[model samples]
Target: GSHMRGPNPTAASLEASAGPFTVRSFTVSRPSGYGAGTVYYPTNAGGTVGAIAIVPGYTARQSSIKWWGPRLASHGFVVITIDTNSTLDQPESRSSQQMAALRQVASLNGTSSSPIYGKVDTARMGVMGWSMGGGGSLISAANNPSLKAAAPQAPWHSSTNFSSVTVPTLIFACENDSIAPVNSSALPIYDSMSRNAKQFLEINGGSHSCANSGNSNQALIGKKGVAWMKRFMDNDTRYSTFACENPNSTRVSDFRTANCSL
Candidate 1:
């Protein structure tokens, strides 16, 4: 586990100061029939009032989602980023392992020793992921009844077990994602999650890795994405300004308005 303060964006001339924020890097205990998994938890130090378990894309490391830690923590949520090292060699076991980690985090909140145990509002948990991790997020949310919200970004088409997911879910699709085309993956899951609250956002000209960075468009989408998570996780309905019905809202760029003019 490592701890470091986030760089203050506004501080330019002087040396940046470090605060109490800590990122815990640890291997999740793989009980049986699986390899060890690595995860990082960025604690607020002020206290983790909530938690969001982030599953990384295929071949991506836990640190890949580090950019999102401070952003989410700024909004009052402890972020747990997970690495699902699934590849051509061990493709078949990744989803199961990811689910195991999700269960581990949820269980931690149920335990007394966990710093987030009592502080975390268990009913407000959410799961978010990109690409392969996106698919795994669906699997994790499907298997765990504790997950209250789920967001799958640039998901793969390998699975349609989304019916297993009963929690509120939001699927973000990249218009130009070659690895997991939006039509084949995200759409199906969005349409299939009938029992739970659901929405689908198509990010025009967005690529598989678009949502990972802090660029202009990515930040725009990130704000809306975070708002969705906060809606169900934090029980805040004020962030519902970007609903799918408002095709011309500024909070979300409407692709259909210009026929998705990229």
Candidate 2:
């Protein structure tokens, strides 16, 4: 019943398409213990949508990564682009806020007064972030094993020892990132995750923000990112061909995956 039920079924699952649904966004504010953010969702996805939260890095706000909201929402997933209490919060603190944002989304699903009521699949959730926020997302996965999936872009953690993570994870690395170098940040963290499913994608000669809104390799990144979340979060193995079989291009400098088969 959950399968074949989205507005656009192939937007990011395998390639870059406009998808089937149009997206709309709104601003949201939590009373306390949570940061403010914007929510994006499909206007007519035909069923409850799985949700994922995206947090920005140090000194950055939602605009830095807001493109993900429409990107995912249009493809049948509710997406929240959030901000921390301070732009300079630590990974652990950001992780807490990320969870708080997700909780807020779940609350919206039950609030009959809200436009998004009954439109979310609260049990199927995922988290993502950029830079320090990316590290924070990794921490969120470590602390909350129930999260369905996680995708951290050019992540930077205080330590690369997340060996207990059971959630399917995807780490996007930049070959030319000076701030959070692949060797010290993304790579080490990817290597440390020895449980569940995992994948690593290195953008050839790209910078820290290369995997965001206006990247030259966005088509590839968008495809893989969406496929990974769908495969894990929704347990939609239809994405296996997309998630497992690389498109094979020069845009991706390196790629690796574990325990996934079509």
Candidate 3:
């Protein structure tokens, strides 16, 4: 019902920081027909903003990416972490609901009553997700031009809709995960992407859930992932080092050479 899990130490440190950087959470109105509980992050400083919408993985709550929220905020991006339905009990409807949440977040940001107003730069935005949320992020990014970039962690391949996406995408696969095997699911999806900027990062010891959050290599991946979104959204070339093509990569393995593009 939320984003990920408990807040990590870095997230707490971020919240402690004063000045333009601060963390706040609130709900957005779903676009009429969609379910409620659309929570997001808004910068403490007022005025126009650059934003990123994060979709969480299976059974994970919004707090799962709390660490990333503060990191992105430090770079001047208003990160909106949405609570998606990804638990085992709700697997059947997770995709549909996640797609709806993406729409709702966009709609809320566009409306005057929405807290996101004046705080979000509609022109520069991106999406990132884990597991089920990763698949949903891919679908949303493909359909929405506003989404400039996407990164899906340990994604499950959805044969029903892989060719629909055209946005720049980064697929993070767990080398040891069996739930959504990288070779069978994530790899094919990455290969099918028509976008020239597609990339596949295989985390050496990562598990499905571990690829998105927590202290280990997963958190390091998350840091790099946030940096990638910042570079594309803000056009901050300094953050370009985080790109997939960079030689000193943070990923355990880079699969761009494996032909992830059409």
Candidate 4:
């Protein structure tokens, strides 16, 4: 699709700390529906790109997932990392706020005075989060099938059944997570989705915060995350291998994919 941005993919390029596009950002002066937000976008993505919203887990702030903003935006996405209205909010609440953040991003795209006014392709969007917020990403996918993609890291939720979700999804699981065990939470949630393209990547020796801001596997995790968004959100075939193929690296303890062949 024309949404494809930046240079052709290479392992070295995707694994780099940043992409080819220079990034710029602005803090939301009046965040609506959700809490505070920071918008990140590529100054020269070559063309408008999809938008992605990321939320933090319970009792956590946007700082937990703030790294994704520049990381994704530099790779040709308009990313927003947000804080919830309350630190104690649950997955469902986080899901609502995450979608609300997406809505505000779309609104900002149409607002003439906004810095991101013409930078976003609002129709193509994705959701992401950590912990409960990760579960919220699932909920957002289930409730809004129009979403192009979802990637939740170490997600936690009450129910495991997400069979109704049609959006393409990627779950970033932490192998040693104690707060939300992979077997009980991540794996089952991944297994429950039988109708859409999905993937599960369990980071080796990781904890609940494995895929958060400062994890040791940013190169791998960021590569997969951006690849998935590019593959599904932008319909860019250049990311097929990076998005669907197993990394087969020691950094990933376990990997599973279904309906993801290009």
Candidate 5:
């Protein structure tokens, strides 16, 4: 019903590492929701860890967003990266599939024979996405107050009013994104949100894929994401410094936060 204390791999590798545990991954399928997914978890996190679901952007698939699987999992989390029912699926549909992926993770937790059994803190789950998937993640956060955390990258949506979201959210924005322009999409969403804990990081000169693989800002983004999830999802105070402190990286064009404690 609750999570066990951790050895805190994330805090030790704030600068970015695969973390303290050996990582493993497996594919999952849902009978009627999202088609396929890959779940990543640490072989030895020293204790159970929170889980986070990630969805890819429009016209994109799991491979486009799959890097987060090992990146976050090795840092003491179970990360589920999923393919939408369709690559063209919009925000609402992506949200449903993202949540469905988490539901399956919970199911696997009790299947006994599954490798992830007893390794996930289902009560402390999170959701995230990229571009349109990012928009879907915001929608997921708005609809599910029970979620512990949410982080959307350069999100784009038909609507910008997500004031009802209460879960801690950290938005990763691309400074020079032409597709999902930051000022129109990412910033307005970040501005409208009133979560007790919220943050926005705009990667300097970044494109829409700034937070993805091969992006230069992964080090800073990875630290921020792990810290956000650790601090809010597990309520692990040890990550407060990572999530709340100034990144002080010149590559960050802008960083804003509200109601956060270190």
Candidate 6:
């Protein structure tokens, strides 16, 4: 693929806490369309890489999703994890801010003084989030068909009709989540998307926070998350198998995928 970065990925390599690239970060001094943000990027990814923007759940701060910053940056992507303009913002509000954050990242790419200047491939970008933020990701995908990918965790949204979404998406579900049960939210959301490649992964006996920063299943969750972005955003067939194959692990309670193949 024209944008593929890093070496061949193995299960062990993908599950590691970090990837091969050296990572560094800088705070977004003058916040733009969204709230405050911190940009994480690789020092040497060989060339320009795709960018990803992540948002936290309702009433949650950046700390809830901060782990993704370095984790994804090390794997060859410029990632910005941000706080919502208001902690109580709903899914729709979060979606707007999420895209705003991505816009700022793109703007930074042209700002010579910015740390991520010339480092981001603005055209190849993705979105991610937690609860309300997760729903925001789905909304972002629906609103912006050009996005390369979307990965939301324990997503909670009022409506589940997202058949219009064409960007590839991966939904992370917590089997035992009380806030947004898989049956009512994630599952239906995944079932609603038919035009693009999609996947559903449920963590066994997990809480709503299972896919959040402090979750214990980072090895498996992180592997799938990174692989999905690499496969879709970078159009790297090297991750096709890793991103398409059902993990079938004991830690996973359920798995489903469509429009994806090795």
Cα lDDT over the full model 6: 0.93
- For candidate 5, write residues 143-216 as lDDT tens digits: 88999999889898999888998989999999999998988889999899775599999999999989886777
Assess candidate 1 and give its lDDT.
Answer: 0.58
Q: By how many angstroms RMSD does model 6 differ from the true structure?
A: 0.8
Tens digits of lDDT, candidate 4, 1-71: 54677788998889989988889999999988787999998887778899999999989998999999988
Model 2: number of clashes?
1
Q: Candidates' TM-scores?
A: 0.70, 0.94, 0.73, 0.98, 0.94, 0.99
Q: If both were scored by TM-score, which would come out higher, candidate 2 or candidate 6?
A: 6
Better of 4 and 5 by lDDT: 4
lDDT of 2: 0.84
TM-score of 2: 0.94
**For model 6, how does the per-residue alpha-carbon lDDT over 70-142 read when each residue is reduced to its tens digit?**
8899999999999888899999999999999999999999999987889988889999999999999999999
TM-score of candidate 6 versus the correct structure, residues matched by position: 0.99
Whichever of 1 and 4 has more lDDT, that candidate is: 4
lDDT of 1 at 199: 74
After superposition, the stretches of candidate 4 with alpha carbons farther than 4 Å from their true spots are none
Candidate 6 deviant stretches above 4 angstroms: none
lDDT of 3 at 66: 57
Candidate 3: 10-residue stretch with minimal lDDT: 1-10
Clashing pairs in 6: none
Which ranges in model 5 have alpha carbons more than 4 Å from their true place? Answer: 1-12, 29-32
Candidates ranked, most accurate by lDDT first: 6, 4, 5, 2, 3, 1
After TM-score superposition, the amount by which residue 70's alpha carbon in candidate 2 deviates from its true location, in angstroms, is 0.8
Which regions of candidate 3 deviate over 4 angstroms?
A: 1-20, 28-47, 85-99, 106-115, 160-164, 245-251, 255-262
Per-candidate total of colliding backbone pairs: 0, 1, 10, 0, 0, 0
